[PDB]
Design a binder for this molecule. Structure first.
Ligand code: PEB
Ligand code: PEB
Ligand code: PEB
Ligand code: PEB
Ligand code: CYC
Ligand code: CYC
Ligand code: CYC
Ligand code: CYC
Ligand code: CYC
Lengths: 100, 160, 206, 92, 177, 160, 103, 161, 160, 161, 161
């Protein structure tokens, strides 16, 4: 638990690292070359091409806050695995209390 | 072995193995057991062959057997068959790892200074290996002895 | 024949080889910080707290450090009635946060041997970030509240290790409070009644 | 200049040792190693001591450490005697 | 005993030197903030009768076995001595802040205090907390961040005198440990 | 080729060629009949392998052909397919030489300097060769597609 | 051994704990009263490890490097046909270089 | 620097005996997987830059080693990483072909953890990068080939630890 | 800085500093008052210098922000401006250090390896710094714009 | 190898923040003494041989290290001294200009006391030579400049001790 | 690298005194044996290969270091021995002429036992080879000349131990 809480403080520190530029690029005019209107040839990027969408969809997004978020999901998997292991250990300790 | 030569030779250029080299590993591994089947044939004929090697190395060179020569005496001749046994054992290694390094990292590199500090005439040892290759042809059929022929004459080329 | 002879060969030589053993540039033999302490058999809680807290990566580095690693009798001496107030809360498993600074106050950038502290009082901040005053007078070298026990231990990267008698707490370190209950106000009318109205602030009402 | 101009694979100068050394780097290691020649028995050159301990620079430690293992050497100990750690500016 | 002027004399006697131009910039900067140092000693000695009761009673509410019978603050004569060495230590630290060097601290206050407190049976770890509350108070008074009495000052940086008085209490707290 | 660098390898080492080197020159020349058939398939399929090669390249990288892309207009798009005809030609050389040595010193050595100096996205031309690879391996059996595709991905590796 | 079929599921009930609450009745209780336990066994019923796991290193082979010269630490298959014995024996060696047979 | 055949020949030679049935039994086991290793080393050569780009973005791309003060901040320091991760993915490819991890400690592992401590490189983040790089390598070469290539990654991670 | 490499220059040559080196350390420190004013202008104009910097960058390179571009979406565009905030910061270091030594070992050494390994078009980030340069030199007089622009174009040169 | 500006930029960069008022406050303090350091380094370059000739004649010229058996007897050994003292007066000049003693331990102090113990060079006489050399350096550059140049001499003497 | 005359001159010079009667007394003792050492170094140069061939065949020729697994098995490893034994018989010849073993530890002994431990060369068999080589050297040069040449062999064996 207390290394999952250290992962959440690193996600909060990674967003404050980029928040002067995340809001500074929020009122720029970023016009692409293709991909939005269908009158321009986009090629592969009409949607996405041939298997490159991923197992989830968030794994194809790059960034400092997406990369520490995948660290959180692998760290919360190991906490939830061992929190469900103390449940059936507590069942067997109470199941052996009905014989004395 | 052969894969080791490709990993090394590709490692000094800081690159993965190219298209041609991966052929050289793939073709070598597909001819795998036939070396394995062949070495078991030769291991069952080591007492076969070294007895035949002592046939002609000494009828060709009675200088070494005679009193005064290096191989004169029982215990000198005793290891004499042992050197054939190690060489024949080395060739089974070379026939398996399909190249010359087990015949070169052992046996060949610095062999002359070994023998010259021993008194064994280095020209006589060349005929000993040539005698050993002459002996391996009889207990081996025509199919597989030219598979093992290039491993012998490398030793003769290494010793000169 | 002079006692302090020298090194070298050829003429103008004193019969002693170069470097006293024929080696000009001697390969070192010390280990690094944390396993020079692991071999000592006295810094057991110190090396273990470093490994758990992640500070041990910092004092792995090659920078010339002057560690003031307390022997575990110092850690065993943390059962003051006083010092247990400000340090017992770190025993909780979520408070690794303060444990790194409190341990990072024991690392000093630089190689300050005790012989280099001949009646000299020089301060410095740690790698924790706050100043510490090293204090060598009357051959009693002090590091905050250290009162160093063993003089120096030569380490790998030109680093030094001094054994201290206690644990140095950083100056502006406040102890973390114990885990508490998030309390909420039961009513809302006991709090509108707790706020002074504008007519109260001008003295118009009692 | 430095060894990271943009060279990588498929570039005109040959693919080689690329060190992360800055402009005129002033960091240097103190290394210790044995490096048997493995080539004297067909060259017959004179013999030289193979156990050396010397200060190699940071600019060329990686090439040297990459090469000491090329010829079967073993590195007994290395340290960063001169230079800082995590230092953005000042390695020059 | 020495001061900050005569510490660099007996350092310059160790090299058989004259006190030349290299060392006088250390001392002319010392008299440059000489008005700052006297503004730091005056914050200590004006609350010094109240800091000693603030610090000894903070030791009691942490380690209450001293006032327990058989303890070391139980007898009322034995309590009045513990208020005395709270302020004799504060008398010798304030001389060390005044002189600028801890020689008079390490030749008169700590000269045998360690074998005193063993032979009186005084608990040494509570003598650390009697000293170190006065460390945390004097760095609050000199930085003027004491939370219930602010003194008037010409404004500016003072953090070197704060760490200097924190360095003198650690030489007390290490010499009696 | 495998013949020329198996020589220059043993050339530098002051020695002849081992059985490991001469049983592969032997193994390569018996492979030569099958190599010319594979290169013969790609030789007169360049109309489809290139034109369908640039098919998927634009449908995957519309930026390079869109206005502002390097291969924009009737002109650059023709040269946009010209380079693919080059690299498809070099793969036919590598298949017959049994190595990327022809592809090495033509189209690979210093390729990043050219395309960086032409303003062309080098990653874009790497995408073009991958699109040609799926068209090429779709024209051959599995035993051949492990070769013809094998030389493309080496070109993909060196081109980034 | 589990030889306690004399002791059932009703071992540690501790029937005689008795609380008088004054001069009235004895108020008999069967509270189980566990110990200051801890049940000292290793490798329990589950894994309890979610990632953060590359701890495995080979054992030290002395002066060579680990797992390199295991040509002395193997079994064997054969020995050869002639094989003159040693007669000087000079101690068994620690693997007789960091170089292998195939140097 | 020994492959599976070199290690088998060495152990059979170090006792002075021929290649018996047990020595050839492992050699036949290596030749059976010879077809799998080349195709594994084939695709890894193709997707070398793509694998390293996937590992760093999945393990340590946005962590605060990437930010200022972290161990990977400056562009020289960032560029040293992908140079550094290239060796792990490359030398692991050599171990996968040779079938023996002797080349790793010969040319990678020795003086490695002693070098990162000198530079102050975080060994913790390094292993997780290799673990993430091992995870993507199992994507390309398949399951069993990933088991083979993965068997040398953790060998690096174990000794580097 | 000019102080540290004028030292390490004369350090390597086994000599002290010449008048040519010491009349410029002298000339640089008297220049130090004017340098802090110039860096003080860029320090609290990063809101406009960066945001207008990415203004012209997207108008000149819509591919990088269009769908498929590296800086596509709300996420990458924020990091798209983050790097410009980095390089604008390093120029403030170079102005105060009187040299690109801070910009050299931060953001320039091995920069092509990073951006090639991130998939970012290195030419695109070079276009971003040029757009920041016109905004920066528009904030200062002619005597200053010959400096603040002077450090940007060095970053432009090393970034391609 | 950092000057005062490099050290100020490093500490302000290592936290990822800009150059605030405190970082520029020290930088302004360094630029104020920029005029003093050059003139200090000016005269020291002129009187380099004269300063070293004054120090050795004032500290260790006639002591019995100079006589037979002493550590400085032979002409090679005597000539090594003034070569050796030249570095201390030279590198101290670099620290006086850079305003940071990082260059000393980077290029002088590391492996220095460990080297003199190998040769058997007396560290006691060495420091007194540098102390006497510090005394004459305060003669030339003045009082405060001598305080600056003197601040790096004892830094050498401290670490060399 | 000092001979008997160099060592005598050094000790007489290191006290700054002339060559008195005691210093010349040893020098006359060295010149008396000057005729013996050259003839000793004469025959050793002639029978260099014969002496080394006699030592290895008498000490470690048939022991199991010579057999597989032993420290001397491969031909490169065997050839390194007689190359290695040549230095001991050669440098001992230099010490016999110079009359001072300073050249041995200067050029042979330093880093030698630390090198054999690295390679894993058995120091026990090495000394017995030199002892056997010392035994044959007393055969050629005679008794007293063998006492002289033998006096530097065990000096190598002592320090190499
Ligand atoms: C920072 C240092 C630190 C400590 C000193 C302890 C202090 C402490 N103890 C408890 C909490 C508790 N403390 C006790 C202990 C006792 N109750 C008794 O009647 C006995 C006399 C005595 C034991 C000898 C009990 C029984 C609980 C309830 C929770 C539990 O049993 O686990 C709590 C949780 C508060 C709450 O939720 O109510 C805290 C902070 N924990 C810390 O983290
Ligand atoms: C010049 C140096 C100098 C000092 C530093 C002080 C300290 C000091 N205190 C006492 C004497 C004492 N000192 C203490 C003090 C304490 N016990 C505690 O539990 C607390 C931790 C601490 C108070 C803060 C007590 C309790 C006595 C009384 C012993 C007694 O009366 O028998 C004595 C012995 C004097 C005597 O009783 O005859 C001395 C030397 N006085 C000095 O002259
Ligand atoms: C259980 C009993 C108990 C106490 C009595 C207090 C005692 C106390 N006060 C302070 C801390 C302090 N104590 C004082 C002392 C004083 N303030 C003044 O203005 C006067 C001069 C003097 C009282 C006469 C000062 C000035 C500080 C610093 C902060 C401040 O109060 O402004 C500290 C150190 C910090 C800490 O550990 O919390 C302690 C232990 N705390 C306790 O836990
Ligand atoms: C409700 C629960 C309950 C109890 C716990 C006992 C308690 C108890 N015991 C006695 C009364 C007594 N208790 C004792 C017992 C003893 N006296 C001794 O001196 C011995 C040390 C000890 C023997 C072990 C004796 C001897 C008497 C008096 C004779 C008797 O009443 O039996 C009385 C009556 C006292 C009176 O008359 O006021 C009571 C209430 N009885 C109860 O009804
Ligand atoms: C101080 C020197 C320095 C630089 C420059 C630097 C760059 C840097 N740029 C990054 C990402 C990135 N950079 C971009 C940049 C761009 N996209 C575009 O279209 C434009 C052409 C361009 C910006 C003008 C994008 C899109 C990412 C995220 C890529 C991904 O998520 O895969 C990352 C990874 C995430 C992070 O940790 O921030 C680093 C480290 N680090 C440094 O230390
Ligand atoms: C693995 C490679 C390898 C080889 C070959 C090897 C050889 C070797 N041959 C030796 C001796 C000898 N070898 C011979 C050999 C011969 N006389 C003849 O007429 C023949 C042509 C020839 C044998 C076929 C003789 C006579 C001696 C004894 C010489 C003596 O000691 O007087 C010795 C000295 C000890 C011993 O006999 O074991 C070695 C080490 N060592 C090795 O490691
Ligand atoms: C072939 C076996 C082998 C390896 C592995 C090797 C590593 C090696 N890594 C180095 C640096 C480095 N390595 C890193 C790596 C990292 N930073 C992080 O945060 C990550 C955890 C990690 C990437 C996975 C960095 C940032 C440097 C530069 C350190 C500096 O400039 O101080 C250096 C210093 C010289 C240079 O890069 O030119 C060497 C020699 N050398 C070898 O011969
Ligand atoms: C045999 C090895 C080999 C190659 C590869 C080669 C390439 C090459 N490509 C060129 C141009 C070009 N190449 C392209 C290519 C592309 N535009 C895109 O959008 C795509 C990403 C990419 C093609 C798939 C364009 C647009 C030009 C013209 C650039 C200009 O006109 O400025 C030119 C200059 C004109 C010419 O002489 O053809 C050469 C020499 N030469 C060689 O000898
Ligand atoms: C001039 C002073 C001096 C000496 C003495 C010296 C020794 C030295 N002996 C070496 C190896 C060796 N030395 C031996 C020696 C022996 N094996 C045995 O069983 C015997 C006990 C012993 C013969 C007496 C062997 C077998 C090797 C090769 C080790 C290997 O390939 O791993 C090597 C490694 C490189 C090489 O030979 O090219 C050096 C440097 N170098 C010097 O500069």
């Amino acid at each position: 638990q207390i290394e999952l809480d250290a992962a959440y403080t690193s996600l909060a520190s990674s967003r404050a690292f980029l928040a002067p530029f995340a809001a500074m690029a929020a009122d720029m005019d970023i016009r692409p070359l293709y991909g939005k209107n269908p009158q321009v040839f986009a090629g592969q990027f009409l949607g996405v091409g041939a298997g490159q969408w991923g197992k989830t969809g968030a794994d194809t997004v790059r960034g400092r806050s997406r990369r520490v978020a995948a660290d959180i999901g692998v760290k919360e998997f190991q906490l939830e695995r061992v929190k469900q292991l103390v449940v059936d250990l507590q069942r067997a300790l109470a199941l052996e209390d009905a014989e004395a | 072995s052969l894969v080791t030569q490709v990993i090394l030779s590709a490692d000094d250029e800081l690159r993965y193995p190219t298209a041609g080299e991966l052929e050289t590993i793939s073709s070598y591994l597909k001819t795998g057991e036939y070396r394995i089947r062949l070495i078991s044939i030769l291991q069952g004929k080591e007492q076969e062959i070294i007895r035949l090697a002592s046939k002609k190395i000494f009828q060709l060179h009675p200088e070494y057997i005679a009193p005064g020569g290096n191989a004169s005496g029982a215990r000198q001749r005793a290891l004499c068959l042992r050197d054939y046994g190690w060489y024949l054992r080395l060739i089974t290694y070379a026939i398996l790892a399909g190249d010359k390094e087990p015949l070169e990292k052992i046996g060949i590199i610095g062999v002359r200074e070994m023998y010259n500090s021993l008194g064994v005439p280095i020209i006589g040892m060349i005929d000993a290996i040539k005698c050993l290759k002459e002996a391996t042809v009889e207990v081996i059929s025509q199919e597989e002895e030219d598979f093992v022929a290039p491993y012998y004459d490398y030793i003769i080329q290494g010793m000169s | 024949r002079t006692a302090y002879p020298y090194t070298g060969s050829g003429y103008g030589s004193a019969g002693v080889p170069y470097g006293q053993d024929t080696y000009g540039y001697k390969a070192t033999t010390a280990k690094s910080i944390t396993e020079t302490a692991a071999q000592a058999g006295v810094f057991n809680t110190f090396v273990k707290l470093l490994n758990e807290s992640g500070v041990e990566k910092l004092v792995e580095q090659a920078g010339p450090y002057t560690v003031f690693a307390p022997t575990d009798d110092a850690f065993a001496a943390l059962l003051e009635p006083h010092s247990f107030n400000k340090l017992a809360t770190l025993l909780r498993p979520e408070n690794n946060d303060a444990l790194r600074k409190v341990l990072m106050h024991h690392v000093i950038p630089g190689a300050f041997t005790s012989a280099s502290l001949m009646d000299r009082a020089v301060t410095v901040k740690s790698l924790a970030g706050e100043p510490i005053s090293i204090m060598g007078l009357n051959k009693l070298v002090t590091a905050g509240t250290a009162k160093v026990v063993r003089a120096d231990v030569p380490c790998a990267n030109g680093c030094i290790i001094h054994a201290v008698s206690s644990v140095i707490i950083p100056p502006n370190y406040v102890p973390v409070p114990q885990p508490t209950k998030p309390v909420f106000p039961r009513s809302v009318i006991a709090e509108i009644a707790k706020l002074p109205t504008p007519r109260q602030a001008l003295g118009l009402d009692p | 200049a430095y060894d990271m101009d943009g060279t990588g694979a498929g570039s005109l100068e040959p693919r080689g040792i690329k060190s992360s050394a800055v402009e005129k780097d002033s960091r240097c290691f103190k290394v210790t190693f044995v490096l048997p020649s493995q080539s004297r028995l067909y060259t017959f050159r004179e013999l030289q001591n193979v156990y050396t301990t010397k200060m190699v620079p940071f600019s060329s430690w990686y090439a040297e450490q990459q090469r000491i293992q090329k010829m079967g050497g073993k590195i007994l100990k290395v340290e960063l005697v001169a230079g800082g750690q995590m230092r953005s500016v000042g390695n020059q | 005993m020495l001061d900050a002027f005569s510490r660099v004399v007996v350092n310059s006697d160790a090299k058989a030197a004259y006190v030349g131009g290299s060392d006088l910039q250390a001392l002319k900067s010392f008299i440059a903030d000489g008005n700052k140092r006297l503004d730091a000693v005056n914050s200590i000695v004006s609350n010094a009768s109240c800091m000693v009761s603030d610090a000894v009673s903070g030791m009691i509410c942490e380690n209450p076995g001293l006032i327990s019978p058989g303890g070391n603050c139980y007898t009322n004569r034995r309590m009045a001595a513990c208020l005395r060495d709270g302020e004799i230590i504060l008398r010798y630290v304030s001389y060390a802040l005044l002189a600028g060097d801890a020689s008079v601290l390490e030749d008169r206050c700590l000269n045998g205090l360690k074998e005193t407190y063993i032979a009186l049976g005084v608990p040494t770890n509570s003598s650390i907390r009697a000293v170190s509350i006065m460390k945390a108070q004097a760095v609050a008074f000199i930085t003027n961040t004491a939370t219930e009495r602010k003194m008037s000052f010409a404004a500016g940086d003072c953090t070197s005198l704060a760490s200097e008085v924190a360095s003198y209490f650690d030489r007390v707290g290490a010499a009696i440990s | 080729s495998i013949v020329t660098k198996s020589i220059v390898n043993a050339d530098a080492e002051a020695r002849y060629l081992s059985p490991g080197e001469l049983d592969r020159i032997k193994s390569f020349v018996l492979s030569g009949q099958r190599r010319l058939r594979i290169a013969q398939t790609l030789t007169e399929n360049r109309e489809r392998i290139v034109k369908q090669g640039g098919q998927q390249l634009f449908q995957r990288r519309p930026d390079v052909v869109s206005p502002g892309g390097n291969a924009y207009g009737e002109e650059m798009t023709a040269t946009c397919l010209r380079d693919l005809d080059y690299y498809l030609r070099l793969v036919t050389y590598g298949i017959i030489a049994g190595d990327v040595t022809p592809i090495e010193e033509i189209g690979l050595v210093g390729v990043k300097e050219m395309y960086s100096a032409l303003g062309t996205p080098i990653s874009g031309v790497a995408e073009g060769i991958r699109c040609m690879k799926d068209v090429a391996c779709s024209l051959l059996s599995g035993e051949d597609a492990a070769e013809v595709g094998f030389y493309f991905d080496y070109t993909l590796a060196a081109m980034q | 051994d589990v030889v306690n079929a004399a002791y059932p599921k009703n071992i540690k009930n501790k029937a005689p704990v008795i609380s008088f609450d004054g001069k009235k009745g004895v108020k008999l209780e069967m509270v189980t009263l566990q110990t200051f336990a801890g049940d000292d066994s290793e490798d329990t019923l589950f894994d309890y490890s979610s990632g953060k796991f590359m701890p495995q290193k080979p054992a030290d082979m002395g002066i060579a490097w680990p797992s390199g010269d295991g040509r002395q630490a193997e079994m064997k298959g054969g020995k050869g046909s002639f094989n003159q014995p040693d007669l000087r024996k000079y101690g068994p060696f620690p693997d007789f270089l960091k170089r292998s047979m195939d140097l | 620097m020994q492959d599976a055949i070199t290690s088998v020949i060495n152990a059979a030679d170090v006792q002075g005996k021929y290649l018996d049935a047990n020595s050839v039994e492992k050699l036949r086991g290596y030749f059976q997987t010879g077809e799998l290793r080349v195709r594994a080393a084939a695709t890894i050569a193709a997707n070398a830059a793509t694998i390293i780009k996937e590992a760093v973005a999945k393990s340590l791309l946005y962590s605060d080693i990437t930010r200022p003060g972290g161990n990977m901040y400056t562009t020289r320091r960032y560029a040293a990483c992908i140079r550094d991760l290239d060796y792990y993915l490359r030398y692991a490819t050599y171990g996968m072909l040779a079938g023996d991890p002797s080349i790793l400690d010969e040319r990678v592992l020795n003086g490695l953890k002693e070098t990162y401590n000198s530079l102050g490189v975080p060994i913790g983040a390094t292993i997780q990068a290799i673990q993430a790089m091992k995870e993507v390598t199992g994507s390309l070469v398949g399951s069993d080939a990933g088991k083979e290539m993965g068997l040398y990654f953790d060998y690096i991670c174990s000794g580097l630890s």
